[PDB]
Write a structure and sequence with these properties.
The structure holds 2 protein chains of 2 kinds. Chain A is α+β, with helices and mostly antiparallel strands. Chain A has helices at about 5-15, 25-35, 55-60, 70-80; strands at about 5, 40, 45-50, 65, 80. Chain A has a single domain (about 1-83), classed as SWIB/MDM2 domain (MDM2, Orthogonal Bundle). Chain A is about 45% helix and about 20% strand. Chain B contains 1 helix and no strands. The chains are: A alpha+beta, B mainly alpha. Chain A: This is Protein Mdm4.
């Protein structure tokens, strides 16, 4: 089980997550749900996520990322999940 | 999107 830091927790809650403690599988699930709630993926190139000007981009340190190269996402999670 | 995301 992991406990997200507050900015990441707010993202998960905005996507429908409840509580403070999660499995990594649950964190990944609600990050995907957040990207869809905020409509951050490109409808015409659906592996591309454009997160500039969103809190998610601020945590990632990126304007965009691809689901085919999730390395910046994993770097963020390592920094923002307390295990 | 979800087809790709759930494949991680």
């Amino acid at each position: 089980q992991v406990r997200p830091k507050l900015p990441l927790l707010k993202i998960l809650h905005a996507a429908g997550a409840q509580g403070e403690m999660f499995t990594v599988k649950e964190v990944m699930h609600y990050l995907g749900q957040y990207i869809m709630v905020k409509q951050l993926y490109d409808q015409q190139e659906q592996h591309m996520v454009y997160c500039g000007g969103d809190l998610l981009g601020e945590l990632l340190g990126r304007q965009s990322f691809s689901v085919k190269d999730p390395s910046p996402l994993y770097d963020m999670l390592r920094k923002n999940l307390v295990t | 999107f979800m087809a790709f995301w759930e494949a991680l």
